[PDB]
Amino acid sequence: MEKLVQPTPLLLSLLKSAGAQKETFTMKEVLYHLGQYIMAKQLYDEKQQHIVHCSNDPLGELFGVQEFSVKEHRRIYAMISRNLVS
């Protein structure tokens, strides 16, 4: 069995706003729903498409950054992990 993780309240809220329906997820599912949220909110930089802008969105408070790159996978996992129940 793959390990299911449990988003804390803010992360869960964002995932559900993107269409998530449950309370526990695989990391793959968490990342999928976050990608949908980012696209839905149009947070991608228009020119450098690997950059996600968080300075105008609650995702900024959630991750604790102003912007991040989708190519920084260890960083993204770390930002998600701070928002899981242990």
Ligand SMILES: CC(=O)N1CCC[C@H]([C@]2(Cc3cccc(Cl)c3)C(=O)Nc3cc(Cl)ccc32)C1
């Ligand atoms: C779907 C799409 O257009 N993509 C292009 C931009 C980056 C999207 C990508 C990349 C990705 C995928 C798996 C793990 C990691 Cl760590 C990152 C994704 O899938 N989910 C996701 C979630 C966040 Cl927080 C930021 C970027 C992404 C995918």
